[model samples]
Target: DIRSQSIHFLEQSPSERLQILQELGLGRFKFLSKIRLNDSNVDCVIRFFQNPGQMKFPNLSGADLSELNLDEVSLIRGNMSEANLQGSSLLNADLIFVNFTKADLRKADLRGATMNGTVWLDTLVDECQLGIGNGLTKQQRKDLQLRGAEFN
Candidate 1:
């Protein structure tokens, strides 16, 4: 059923995507395949995740996730740079020092997220413009563990 829904979404046009989300009631339990979500006007009403169950995002990047559910998901050290995540849900999600540099999160929901031990690098925003300390806290830098990884 989820796969079918995903296929349906893929086949829909920009306007049709919104209709499908509305008809589906809150847009929960949907799946999506290869589609460039970043900077697409379609991001105004859609969310993307690896799966509906517990999983990790090792090779996910440059995807649009402006609005959607991602409750309790684990994304350890994944590259999510320049991805759109406005109005998206990430409740209680584990983001152990992942790369969110230059990622759009204007109205994204980050309630109960764990950002301990992550590298924000040069990604952050200030006064609506992308800045170095965009949304990072000092504690996150301290919690980072650079064991065998090389940092330049």
Candidate 2:
């Protein structure tokens, strides 16, 4: 479906992509996840993530957000399950209630990210930048360890 008609998706301008993605809604969860985002619209994504205000929860489940700089972005209550976040930097980001189920975060920087009520079902966090400085409480950190999270 998306693979057949989305070949020219990247050819669209950043503004167009943003608008299309917004209008697509959960359709993004279905189609946009497989689209590899480069500099074309990744910056646009960061721009949107940085300014969704405090209550506007972004629904970006299963999106491809790999290898980008998303420092200080707030994704509170955002649905991002099954998304790709490999090598992405999320320092000082607000991630309360963000669903990361089955997502790939290998080598992703999660330093100082707020993780209150964050979902973690089968999420891949190998070699990520996590520590006591992250907002996860002691009990939650212990929980994460038992749930297959490893860190240095």
Candidate 3:
């Protein structure tokens, strides 16, 4: 189980956090590299170094981004629901989840982020058809909608 406020290490400065993240190799996961916001505090840390006005990742959710440099992350899940991406550059992030029932995709980069599982309420996505290059599937999109209720 991942505890919420369990900072195994500390990062007084943004550069220190960057160093730790570089060593950890965040967003480099083979399968989930496209979408990896595995950490909670990562948003604040990234904000400390990077600026939010220019960052992206409008739609993010449950990720372990301990120390990653998300300059132009994508908006995953409905209208950026569950995304905790703070800071980082959003040079030209995509407008994913445009019609998603629940989307809170705040600041984050999006230059070339993927656009999957973004549709209307009754739109039915094909099971075999992969949602986005990331790993968003039909079922996951439905689940994201369910979780987006609280945000709405």
Candidate 4:
């Protein structure tokens, strides 16, 4: 993947932290803060913001994004099996479509976000998902309500 042309710039680091520093362009400033660096998919998304880049079809397969601010993120048709999106915030707009199979979504915020066809088979959704995302269809809302994901 190092030399693959299709590989994203955000996915080019042998060490995600090093890459994060390179993208943040200031380890001194970023290290002092809490920046999640477990998954490259999420890393690149942050990279898009840190350095201002354009991305399409972000692949978020099993990204352990520990409550990272994923606001205005564009996610389409991604496989998120057993992914940990605990306390993550997806505000404003641009959040959508995902195969959230066995995914952890406790306390995740999806305000003004869209989640159509977001399948949550056997997923963990405790601690109030805090979503009114402007598009949580009847079935999705019903399921979340039953799952104890309250929206306020």
Candidate 5:
């Protein structure tokens, strides 16, 4: 399975990891190009990370990223607005300044992420776990609570 393969892949160097990701049809530059052009890079990226693990600095804005396992990834400054991220796991991710406006984060796990300056306007958090250690203000927490997210 891909999870077993991911364990082996994680042992490789960063350059090797990038090369393998390119070989597996999820090249970072290529994916960014698609995102910049507003093309569809959802299925390709989701398939590349099928095991639901770590990926540093993925710019997946305006794409369909629902139901993926993205635990412990570094997504600093990623522009992810208007995307569908329902049922994804973002536990312990570095999500600082990530724009999540109008995105669907239903049932997503956001525990232990550095969420300073994150934009959550109209973002969905139904049944989602918004753990502590984020940079959310009191009003923001209340807003998320109003949106149906659980805080730990």
Candidate 6:
């Protein structure tokens, strides 16, 4: 079964586990619950979602998430400082109060998401979107626009 396989996969080394996941075509499946990502696990996950897939919100903080699809996930108050989120889709996700300091967010999708008090200190925002949200400052909106992001 997939669940059993997932457990087994977790036991292997990060590279080996990633290979198995790629072979099984289980990259998009949300098989694990409450994932705690380290560097190796993050690398595995990043490879797993090289092609777009549905991944439920795992307990990710201070991990590399560059070019992953995180659409429709809830990540309230998560600390994603210095992470790479370039080209990811956070469409309609709940991202209230998330810390994205010094993160790369080029070409990311934030349409219809809530980001109250989100920190974007020195973060890249090229071609991103701020579809809808609260607590955004005028300067923040302007900053997003300057970086080619649209807000509504």
The models' CA-based lDDT, in order, is 0.49, 0.66, 0.36, 0.59, 0.69, 0.64
* Candidate number with the higher lDDT (4 or 6): 6
> lDDT, candidate 6, residue 107?
82
- Candidate 1 residue 81 Cα shift, in angstroms, is 0.8
Candidate 4 wrongly placed segments (more than 4 Å): 1-35, 39-56
**Per-residue alpha-carbon lDDT of candidate 1 for residues 28-86, written as tens digits (9 for 90 to 100):** 32323223343442332233322422332443456666566666667777667766666
| Model 6 spans > 4 angstroms off | 1-59, 133-135
C-alpha displacement of 53 in model 4, angstroms?
14
TM-score of every model versus the real structure = 0.48, 0.63, 0.32, 0.61, 0.66, 0.61
Model 6 TM-score, all chains together:
0.61
lDDT for each residue of candidate 6 in 16-74, tens digit (9 for 90 to 100): 65566566565433322223344444444553354433443333444556556677777
Prediction 6 global C-alpha lDDT? 0.64
Q: Report the Cα lDDT for candidate 1.
A: 0.49
Using lDDT as the measure, the top candidate is: 5
Off by over 4 Å in 1: 1-57, 121-152
In model 4, what are the clashing residue pairs, if there are any? Answer: none
| Tens-digit lDDT track of model 5 for 1-152 | 65456445545565666687677655633322212111344333443476333545555666766666676666778878888778878888878889998899998888887899899988887988988838988898888898898987
Error of 4 at 28 (Å): 26
Please write out the lDDT profile of model 3 over residues 40-134, one tens digit for every residue: 44443343224432433432333333223554444443233333333334333343554433222323333344554455343222221222323
Worst 10 residues of 4 by lDDT: 26-35
The TM-score of candidate 5 is 0.66
Residue 93 of candidate 3: its Cα lDDT? 38
